[PDB]
Amino acid sequence: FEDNFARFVCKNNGVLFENQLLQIGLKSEFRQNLGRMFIFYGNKTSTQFLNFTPTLICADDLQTNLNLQTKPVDPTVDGGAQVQQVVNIECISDFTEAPVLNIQFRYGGTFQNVSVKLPITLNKFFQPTEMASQDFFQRWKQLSNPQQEVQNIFKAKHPMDTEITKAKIIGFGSALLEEVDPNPANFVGAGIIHTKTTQIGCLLRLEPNLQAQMYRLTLRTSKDTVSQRLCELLSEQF
């Protein structure tokens, strides 16, 4: 099997899970604190699936932070057919955990049971905000409380590739701000995390070291837990 949850930080669409029997494809869209996720259950076999009952599971804290609404789907999935489920998503507040999609079905007399995390991460509610450099620096200096900054220094997992790095920052949900850092090698981003009761301004600086293949990533936001979660999600992409 293939489980691709961790490959959805900076993209919205693709195969989430695939094994010999079943493909779970996914498309998703987000705006402000809301999203919609289309789940596509593909029957790769010649036998229908039966009592197919997808269950969304949200761990302890997560249910108060993240609201998911869906309809019942086909109990029966004909062989070679593809069936759609739509999930409506609302971010009530920031969160770390991901919802779990659990899939149980009968198949030719055999009991099938699959679980995979849905790619609903905090940065799906992250929208880009362009701004001039003096505005950026006023905002950065406004976030001067030590709790607001989370910094990570880490070895690159991927090539030190400028154009790919730019696309990652953009696919993450940040604006990419040019000519703000007077070092043209560095990357600066800005956006807003949308929740039900607040917008959280988020600023970031990514500093490559080409010769050492290292990065320093810094994220400043008005909420410690947002700075932390955004930094750990974004650090993992480079």
């Binding site: 293939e2 195969v15 695939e18 498309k27 596509f40 070679g80 593809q82 759609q84």
Partner: peptide
């Protein structure tokens, strides 16, 4: 009749 919203674990 047959075809899917197509996704792929390989190519591309």
């Amino acid at each position: 009749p047959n075809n899917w919203a197509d996704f792929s674990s390989t190519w591309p």
